[PDB]
Design a protein around this ligand. Structure first.
Ligand SMILES: *[C@@H]1O[C@H](CO)[C@@H](O[C@@H]2O[C@H](CO)[C@@H](O[C@@H]3O[C@H](CO[C@H]4O[C@H](CO)[C@@H](O)[C@H](O[C@H]5O[C@H](CO)[C@@H](O)[C@H](O)[C@@H]5O)[C@@H]4O)[C@@H](O)[C@H](O[C@H]4O[C@H](CO)[C@@H](O)[C@H](O)[C@@H]4O[C@H]4O[C@H](CO)[C@@H](O)[C@H](O)[C@@H]4O)[C@@H]3O)[C@H](O)[C@H]2NC(C)=O)[C@H](O)[C@H]1NC(C)=O
Ligand SMILES: *[C@@H]1O[C@H](CO[C@@H]2O[C@@H](C)[C@@H](O)[C@@H](O)[C@@H]2O)[C@@H](O[C@@H]2O[C@H](CO)[C@@H](O[C@@H]3O[C@H](CO)[C@@H](O)[C@H](O)[C@@H]3O)[C@H](O)[C@H]2NC(C)=O)[C@H](O)[C@H]1NC(C)=O
Ligand SMILES: *[C@@H]1O[C@H](CO)[C@@H](O)[C@H](O)[C@H]1NC(C)=O
Lengths: 117, 318, 105, 344, 340, 332, 331
């Protein structure tokens, strides 16, 4: 009964930035790290970065370093991702997962399409 | 009962941490010691095991009572309850009291307040064995003790009427040495913590030659005799004379190794090591003489034992 | 980073046939390999966790096995519903997933 | 009064705290996020098939009983507080004889974060055991396990987890390499389940992949072995005529090989299966014994005893010349096959 | 629950520092030993280890009860609570009171008041050894024990069953590897001290060293070396390399045998009977070398015999090969008869 | 909620609990069941005449006072509660040095089952002793035992048994000793009687056969090779006295060194060892070869000289071969 | 009255004291000053790569709780009071097996000062492990350090220092190791960072220099005398194979047994140590000494006098070149 509800689809133009949210439900936000995943259309899943909600520590993908910023709000249970310097290559659908253990990603976000043209 | 009430009266309101009359005067302690047996002298580690019955008489004002009984003769259950002189042995590497079947301590409290606290110990005390003339080295291995924390101002040691209570030496584990005597000294030492009043017993011990004589000395001497035997054998027997020479130097190397491994390893030449080195130059000269011969012999036959004999005489004088 | 390589990119196995997937990580991943089902217009759903163990509420048809660096997710009695892209994820290091193994009747 | 607030906080935490009961006993499973910081990988005692490892065994677990809201966010307390609260009974399944250092005082830090996320690290001299199959020894990579779990609790009671990513959990200090002869290639982490008579235990295996460096045994064993073999070959060059010198050469070489074989075996445990070193020794033993058999054959056909001067003399043995070329060659081919088979 | 009430009644108002009937009379501890396994005897340290059931029995007036049960076997922990005699071993060096799984101890309060207190120890007691007849030697190793704090007017010891029955030694439980336990004799005596007069028991375990181990490890190799030295005489005197290598090798093994024997021996100046045997064997081999030294003087021909003056066999060699074995035989027979 | 319930239960159970009195004191003897799970039997030292037995040692006695029914689950408490609980005063009669493992905390298990069954557990590296008959060493099938016994409680107050019969001991097959091979293990329940009274004994026994391959590599095969080395002197000409004697005493001395090295590595026992029987046999072979060389020297100095060489050359390997056949028939 | 007053004062100090909280907890770190008096350095076990060091480890710090002004003297309570007080949780990271001496009572000192300072002394035997880099051994100037470090307190809660820049360490000059010689000792203060934070650390870094003559007599004299023995073979006649061959094998065998004996004593080191580099050099020289006769025999049976003479003069020369290059390389 854990639902990770995200903001939704977004349509933008190159150069600007987009902020996408992820509001976890059920399990306490601080308890489990939030991993962000990029799904290029027709391609595999790619991990972006995980933010430890309690102390707001972050770790980012080397390819995504700088282009993605992770900020977590605990007063309202939500993890945000700021994507900057958008290009055509970044048009994809983004999910926010949850790591339950060292084994599996427990529950995944509904899905946030992002279009750049 | 009548003794339990006295014991409870003594321990009621008794501060175990504080010493008798702290600040009022330096508490005087008499530490007449009994020796059960001086164990083997671990010369390799520069230490020696000694089994002692260490008794410390200190007059504690707090442990005073008045009744028909003139003394309370208690077991080791009482030692922890009362204040004890925090005596540590200064040159002790590993020391441990005996605990089986119960802790091996006794505590006697006299009516006036004199407390006699004897305990059994197996102390591995340190002594610096200068092995410059090994094995002909007569040592004086000391033991020391004073309070670890209390300075000279707050604790003073002394010896009682019986200076040292040495037991029967026949049952002692002193294998190489022979216990010569006891000398007791009281000195004052200055350290970072402060100035203490250390009390150092000195056990004068005399070393003998019963084990080294046949383990290394007589073997190496007879190896030198084998070097003598080399000269007498016919020169024409080339492989035999060479084989004897090389085997003799092999004996010298093996004996120099067993001699060193038995001894503690030190950064100076010992008389044992000077003896083996002289036997080494002797055999080396013998082989060099044979090599020169191959490319006179009668003179060398008499020359080598004579030099060896003079070397022995110089050793016996020293 | 670790790379997950689903060997058969596409399959056309019939309904009820034993259909076997195979996934291979470049480096050691231990038992921390998970299989996820990606139906179209749907987020991934966990199907196998810890390589062999099954997540709660999963049908028994999904049998997952294999040691470290070689894994298999076999659907012995595949139905219409259990026919979609499958990605093998890993978490022994920074997580990375694999190319979807698509199916079509 | 500055330190009185923290005293009242600690006394409030320990008030009614039953340290016998685990967190969530009967409610939830206990998640023990545990990681290791190897301060130094102690010497691997290959003789006992055990290795010593010095670690900062960090382990963290949320404990709802230890909740506080004070001036400080983290209570860095002393080890005395540790015995006052529930710590997991983690034990090493292959830990033979270990000791937690307590000099000067116990070396366990207990940090209580304000949410109750305990962090309880301790220093340990874990003398754990590796089941070693030293068949390719010394050229034997070993995955020395460090399995640790809860002695009393089952998987339904406490489950062990890694603090960070499994690769990023067992960290090792760069300077902490007490390995005299081994070389820690790395650590591979794995978590699983072990069935026991009392129940199912979760186990956190950590294969420290140690690659043994042959540099100790190249000079300790391999160089004396090879030099003894080429001594037995130096025999061949020496003339057949000299019977005492060649015989003493052969006997001394084989006697050396015997002492080397016993010296080699002494280092390793008394395992049944012969090590790769043992095969190398056996082949070297074959070579030295073959050299002595070779000279025994030459003496069998050595018709004359007196040697060359300046009256027919002996001829150089056809076996001598053949062995002169073959034995180095045969050894070289054997050595190349040996090193290629074991190194690769 | 009733047995808890009785036990707390016994321990209530109890002083574990005072003696049973302190002042009124001297308490009479009674001891009996059941050596479970007479452990290895360490010749190097002159100490022997014994694993013993150390029963002690003493009448304690405070610890008497009346109830449904007659004799009360209690947990070993109650041993700490009640007064036990402060027995210590006068020659005990490094003892152990086993605690696996719990303290290996027994404590029964008999109905009349008598206590029975047992413990499985591992006493590394000192046993002074006179090795002048080693290895074929007999040792009377004592096991002394007495109160460390209570004078003879305070505590006395007296064997319960008797001289022969109090000390029991199970022959099957005999960890004596290189020793044979001939028997045990128990005595009781008094020790005078500057601190007081005390009662001291002693269990003189009479142990006979098993010659079967040193006949193999050290005596037989020495005999083989002596035989090898005599084998040198059988070898031709013209084979000077052979006689030389034989002499040097035999002396070298004899020396390493002496060194190994003294390695097994404490570094004492006793010059043991084993050392005497090694010494006379050394004199035998060295005398054989001296024989080769003197025969080498008169090897005038220096050419071997073929089968052109050929060397005549030395008369010394002929006499040596006959009386060296005979002298060794009679020296052995004298040695064994003197020590047996 | 539930935590308070468990605290109330364990508090009631340990309240007014006399550790000094066994369950049903003044009643029937408590049946203690034991199911050992061997972790290893590593370091079976014949020098000290003992073996270290790293074992999971479980006891399963029934304790009436430890009865609870409100909680359905098995209460698995910390090791510290073991100090507050009546544990049987059991011991290993042949234990020499034993200790419960220390890190991180003391290795004990306490599991209070609702019915009153108590599952005590320990992890013990006991250096249990077993007298070894080294007359067949190294081919001996040593029968070493762990004698679990109650120290202070006689049969009237306690009785020992094996839960699950032979299956009480688990994992012995998994144990891989380096030189030994656990060929058979047996479970028996003796009843030994001391002066104090009868007692319950659980002499859990293993018959562990020493693998001969390792001793072949380290002891036997080098001895055989040195024996062949001695036999090489038969192939050498008799007139090469220096060479033949050098081979002779080198083989003899190496055999003496090996025997003394073994005795240094072996304990102090009088009975001749089977390994020592082989060593002495090889010593006799090398000694007889040296005596043969002495014989031919005496014959030549003080056809036939070649004849004795030839037939000794043929006879000696045959004699050694049949000696080995008699040997392995004697033991294997 | 005096003794009772001291009793009341100590009872006041220990009443309400909390061992859990360090001095000024939740505040600035307390400057705990170290001070050491080396009793002796017992053994330097290269075999186990550690050294045994008996010390008088004194730690003094300002604890405002333990401040008494009534009595004008310095109290030195029994050592058991330390169990009731707070002390720094100092640990030696190099320590493998360390203890405080026990006879008669536990070797420990607690001397409270009037201002508030405590002086917590301990007599500690520590078997500290310094991973020694022996590529110059026996001509090696090793370091071995004592890593005095707090375990549970970061730099935000404690701070170590040496009372006096070099007055905190004493009794080091008087020490005499039969194996070593303390050329120098340093005092280092750092703040090491682990994943849990940054902790203050002190390093007592002895730069022990090996006694060279110890080995020139023990280990090197056999090597050089054996090499001379190998040279001895070069004066024997070429037609003496039974002699020269036996001597050559005997020498190289002696070198092998010596080298193995040393490496048996020394730990299972994976590289060529300078002692090993010298034994290897001697091994090469004595093997080439054997191969000299090998070659002579070969050439004659299968000039030679000249080859002997050239080996007689060449071997000491190039051996001296090896020696001097080795000496200047390592000293
Ligand atoms: C770091 O860890 C180490 C362990 O690795 C801890 O060391 C242990 O500490 C405990 C408690 O502090 C010690 O327990 C005490 O033991 C006394 C007897 O010890 C002897 O037996 C033990 C086995 O039980 C042996 O291990 C000991 O040998 C070792 O210690 C000595 C020095 O002590 C060394 O010299 C040796 O080489 C070994 O290293 C001993 O042989 C025992 O008497 C004592 O019990 C009394 O004290 C307690 C105090 O609370 C009382 O509650 C109790 O009732 C006893 O008091 C009665 O008896 C005394 C007898 O004198 C009377 O005076 C009293 O008034 C009263 O009547 C206690 O149990 C343990 O010995 C020790 N060593 C170990 C386990 O090896 C360190 O403490 C720890 N911390 C630091 C900072 O180092
Ligand atoms: C058996 O082992 C020890 C004592 O026996 C010893 O065991 C070996 C180590 C050998 O050295 C033997 O020679 C020797 O006889 C017992 O240890 C003691 O346990 C008790 C509790 O069982 C401890 O009491 C506790 O102490 C803590 C200290 O914080 C208190 O908080 C507790 O309230 C309680 O009082 C005691 O300290 C401890 N003594 C030590 C460690 O020296 C051990 O318990 C015993 N086995 C059993 C089952 O009792
Ligand atoms: C004991 O009592 C006697 C008799 O009253 C008295 O003289 C003596 O001073 C008392 N000793 C004390 C109180 O220490």
């Amino acid at each position: 009964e854990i639902q990770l509800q995200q903001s939704g689809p977004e349509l933008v133009k190159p150069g600007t930035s987009v902020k996408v949210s992820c509001k976890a439900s059920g399990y306490s936000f601080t308890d489990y790290n939030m991993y962000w995943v990029k799904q290029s259309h027709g391609k595999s899943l790619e991990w972006i970065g995980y933010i430890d909600p309690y102390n707001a520590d972050t770790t980012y993908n080397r390819e995504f370093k700088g282009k993605a910023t992770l900020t977590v709000d605990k007063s309202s249970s939500t993890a945000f991702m700021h994507l900057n310097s958008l290009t055509s290559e970044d048009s994809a659908v983004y999910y926010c997962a949850r790591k339950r253990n060292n084994f599996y990603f427990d529950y995944w976000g509904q899905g946030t399409p992002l279009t750049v043209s | 009962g009548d003794v339990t009430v006295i014991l409870n009266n003594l321990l009621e309101g008794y501060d175990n941490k504080l010493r008798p009359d702290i600040g009022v005067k330096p508490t005087l302690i008499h530490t007449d010691m009994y020796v059960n047996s001086i164990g083997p002298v671990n010369a390799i580690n520069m230490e020696y095991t000694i089994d002692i019955f260490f008794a410390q008489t200190w007059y504690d004002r707090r442990l005073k009572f008045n009744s028909t009984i003139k003394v309370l003769r208690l077991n080791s259950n009482m030692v922890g309850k009362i204040w004890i002189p925090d005596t540590f042995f200064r040159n002790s590497k590993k020391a441990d009291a005996h605990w089986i079947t119960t802790p091996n301590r006794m505590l006697r409290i006299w009516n006036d307040g004199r407390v006699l606290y004897t305990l059994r110990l197996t102390i591995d005390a340190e002594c610096q064995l200068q092995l410059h003339n090994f094995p002909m080295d007569e040592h004086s291995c000391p033991l020391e003790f004073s309070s670890y924390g209390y300075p000279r101002e707050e604790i003073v040691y002394q010896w009682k009427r019986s200076s040292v209570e040495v037991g029967d030496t026949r049952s002692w584990r002193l294998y190489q040495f022979s216990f010569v005597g006891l000398r007791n000294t009281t000195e004052v030492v200055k350290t970072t913590s402060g100035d203490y009043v250390v009390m150092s017993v000195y056990f004068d011990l005399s070393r003998r030659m019963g084990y080294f004589t046949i383990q290394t000395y007589i073997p190496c001497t007879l190896i030198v005799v084998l070097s003598w035997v080399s000269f007498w054998i016919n020169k024409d027997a080339v492989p035999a004379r060479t084989s004897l020479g090389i085997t003799t130097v092999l004996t010298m190397t093996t004996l120099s190794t067993i001699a060193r491994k038995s001894l503690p390893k030190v950064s100076y030449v010992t008389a044992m090591d000077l003896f083996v080195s002289v036997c080494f130059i002797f055999v080396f000269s013998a082989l060099v003489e044979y090599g020169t011969l191959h490319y006179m012999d009668s003179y060398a036959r008499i020359f080598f034992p004579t030099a060896f004999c003079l070397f022995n005489l110089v050793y016996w004088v020293s | 980073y670790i790379v997950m390589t689903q060997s058969p990119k596409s399959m056309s196995m019939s309904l009820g046939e034993r259909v076997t997937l195979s996934c291979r990580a470049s480096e050691y991943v231990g038992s921390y390999v998970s299989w996820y089902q990606q139906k179209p217009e749907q987020s991934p759903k966990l199907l196998i966790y810890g390589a062999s163990n099954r997540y709660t509420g999963v049908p028994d048809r999904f049998a997952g096995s294999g040691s470290a660096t070689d894994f298999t997710l076999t659907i012995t009695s595949v139905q219409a519903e259990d026919l979609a892209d499958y990605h093998c994820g890993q978490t022994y290091n920074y997580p990375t997933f694999g190319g979807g193994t698509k199916l079509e009747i | 009064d500055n330190t009185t607030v923290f005293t009242r906080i600690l006394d409030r935490l320990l008030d009614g705290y039953d340290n016998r009961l685990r967190p969530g006993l009967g409610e939830r499973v206990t998640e023990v996020k545990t990681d290791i910081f190897v301060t130094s990988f102690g010497p691997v005692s290959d003789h006992d098939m055990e290795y010593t490892i010095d670690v900062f065994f960090r382990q963290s677990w949320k404990d709802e009983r230890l909740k506080f809201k004070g001036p400080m966010t983290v209570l860095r307390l002393n080890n005395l507080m540790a015995s006052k609260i529930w710590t997991p009974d983690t034990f090493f399944h292959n830990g033979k004889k270990s000791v937690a250092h307590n000099m000067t005082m116990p070396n366990k830090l207990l940090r209580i974060t304000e949410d109750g996320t305990l962090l309880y690290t301790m220093r340990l001299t874990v003398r754990a055991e590796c089941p070693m199959h030293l068949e390719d020894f010394p050229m034997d990579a070993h995955a020395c396990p460090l399995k640790f779990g809860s002695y009393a609790y089952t998987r339904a009671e406490v489950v062990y987890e890694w603090t960070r990513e499994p690769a990023r959990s067992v960290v090792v200090a760069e300077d902490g390499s007490r390995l005299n002869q081994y070389d820690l290639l790395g650590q591979t982490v794995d978590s699983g389940i072990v069935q026991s008579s009392t129940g199912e235990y979760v186990v956190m295996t950590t294969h420290f992949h140690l690659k043994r460096k042959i540099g100790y045994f190249v000079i300790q064993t391999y160089l004396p072995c090879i030099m003894t073999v080429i001594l037995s070959q130096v025999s061949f060059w020496l003339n057949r005529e000299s019977v005492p010198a060649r015989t003493v050469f052969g006997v001394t070489t084989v006697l050396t090989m015997t002492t080397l074989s016993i010296s080699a075996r002494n280092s390793l445990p008394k395992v049944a299966y012969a090590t790769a070193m043992d095969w190398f020794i056996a082949v070297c033993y074959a070579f030295v014994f073959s050299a002595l058999i070779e000279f025994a054959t030459v003496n069998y056909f050595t018709k004359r005893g007196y040697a060359w001067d300046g009256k027919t003399f002996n001829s150089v043995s056809k076996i001598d010349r053949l062995s002169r070329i073959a034995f180095p060659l045969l050894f070289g081919i054997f050595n190349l096959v040996y090193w290629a088979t074991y190194l690769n | 629950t009733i047995f808890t009430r009785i036990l707390d009644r016994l321990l209530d108002g109890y002083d574990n520092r005072l003696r049973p009937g302190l002042g009124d009379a001297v308490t009479e501890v009674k001891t009996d030993i059941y050596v479970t396994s007479f452990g290895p005897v360490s010749d190097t340290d002159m100490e022997y280890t014994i694993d013993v059931f150390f029963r002690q029995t003493w009448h304690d007036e405070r610890l008497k009860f009346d109830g449904p049960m007659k004799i009360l076997p209690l947990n070993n922990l109650l041993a700490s609570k009640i007064w036990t005699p402060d027995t210590f071993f006068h020659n005990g060096k490094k003892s152990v009171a086993h605690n696996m799984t719990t303290p290996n101890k027994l404590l029964r309060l008999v109905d009349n008041g008598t206590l029975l207190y047992t413990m499985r120890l591992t006493i590394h007691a000192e046993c002074p050894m006179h090795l002048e007849d080693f290895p074929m030697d007999v040792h009377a190793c004592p096991l002394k024990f007495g109160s460390y704090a209570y004078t003879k007017a305070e505590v006395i010891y007296s064997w319960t069953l008797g001289k022969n029955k109090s000390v029991e030694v199970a022959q099957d439980g005999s960890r004596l590897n290189q020793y044979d336990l001939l028997g045990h004799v128990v005595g009781t005596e008094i020790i005078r001290s500057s601190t007081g007069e005390y009662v001291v028991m002693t269990t003189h375990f009479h142990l006979k060293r098993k010659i079967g181990y040193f006949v193999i490890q050290t005596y037989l190799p020495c005999i083989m070396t002596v035989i090898l030295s005599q084998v040198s005489f059988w070898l031709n005197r013209e084979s000077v390399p052979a006689r030389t290598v034989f002499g040097v090798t035999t002396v070298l093994t004899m020396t390493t045998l002496s060194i190994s024997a003294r390695n097994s021996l404490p570094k004492v100046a006793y010059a043991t009977a084993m050392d005497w045997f090694i010494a006379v064997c050394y004199a035998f081999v060295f005398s054989a070398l001296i024989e080769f030294a003197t025969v080498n003087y008169f090897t005038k021909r220096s050419w071997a015999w073929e089968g052109k003056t050929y060397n005549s066999v030395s008369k010394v060699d002929k006499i040596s090969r006959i009386i060296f074995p005979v002298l060794f035989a009679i020296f052995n027979l004298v040695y064994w008869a003197t020590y047996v | 909620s539930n935590m308070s319930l468990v605290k109330e239960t364990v508090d009631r159970l340990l309240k007014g609990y006399d550790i000094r009195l066994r369950p049903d004191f003044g009643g029937p003897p408590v049946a203690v069941g034991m199911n050992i799970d061997i972790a290893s039997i590593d370091m079976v030292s014949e020098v000290n005449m003992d073996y270290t037995l790293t074992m999971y040692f479980q006891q399963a006695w029934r304790d009436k006072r430890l009865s609870y029914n409100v909680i359905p689950l098995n209460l698995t408490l910390d090791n510290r509660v073991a100090d507050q609980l009546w544990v049987p005063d059991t011991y290993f009669l042949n234990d020499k040095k034993s200790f419960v493992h220390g890190v991180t905390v003391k290795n004990r298990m306490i599991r209070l089952h609702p019915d009153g069954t108590v599952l005590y557990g320990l992890r013990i590296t006991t250096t249990a002793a077993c007298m070894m008959d080294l007359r067949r060493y190294p081919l001996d099938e040593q029968n070493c035992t762990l004698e679990i016994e109650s120290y202070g409680y006689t049969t009237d107050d306690i009785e020992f048994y094996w839960r699950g019969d032979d299956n009480a001991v688990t994992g012995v097959t998994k144990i891989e000793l380096p030189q030994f091979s656990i060929v058979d293990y047996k479970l028996i329940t003796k009843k030994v009687v001391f002066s104090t009274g009868s007692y319950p004994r659980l002499s859990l026994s293993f018959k562990l056969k020493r693998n001969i391959g390792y001793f072949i590599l380290q002891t036997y095969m080098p001895s055989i090779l040195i024996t062949i080395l001695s036999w090489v002197s038969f192939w050498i000409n008799y007139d090469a006295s220096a060479a033949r004697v050098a081979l002779g005493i080198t083989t003899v001395l190496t055999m003496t060194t090996i025997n003394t090295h073994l005795r240094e590595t072996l304990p102090k026992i009088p009975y001749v060892k089977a390994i020592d029987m082989y060593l002495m046999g090889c010593f006799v072979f090398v000694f007889m070869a040296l005596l043969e060389y002495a014989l031919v020297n005496y014959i030549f100095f003080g056809t036939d000289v070649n004849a004795i060489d030839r037939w000794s050359r043929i006879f000696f390997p045959v004699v050694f071969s049949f000696f080995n056949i008699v040997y392995w028939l004697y033991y294997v």
